[PDB]
Amino acid sequence: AIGIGTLIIFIAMVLVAAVAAAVLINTSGFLQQKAMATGKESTEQVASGLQVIR
């Protein structure tokens, strides 16, 4: 009966789509930190310095 295979391949299809989703969630995590730090650091750099009075 045709039904049997239709079920089995659905199981696979779900699983693959899960794995594909995962990589985006993971990568978004990696990028989050890297981005946030880059902004903070760059800001402090411009904002700060010393001045010779005399």
Buried b (16+ CB within 10 A) or exposed e, 27-43: eeeeeeeeeeeeeeeee
Give the separation between CA 17 and CA 27, rounded to whole angstroms. 16
What are the backbone dihedrals phi and psi of residue 47, each rounded to the nearest 5 degrees, phi first? -75, -15
> In the complex, what is the shortest distance from the CB of residue 13 to a second copy, in angstroms, rounded to a whole number?
10
Position 24 contacts a second copy (CB under 8 A):
yes
Binding a second copy (rule: CB under 8 A), the pick from 39, 50, 53, 54 is: 39
Position 26 contacts a second copy (CB under 8 A):
no
In the chain, the amino acid numbered 17 is A
Position 49 contacts a second copy (CB under 8 A):
yes
What residue ranges bind a second copy (CB under 8 A)?
A: 1, 3-4, 7-8, 10-11, 14-15, 17-18, 21-22, 24-25, 27-28, 31-32, 34-35, 38-39, 42, 45-46, 49
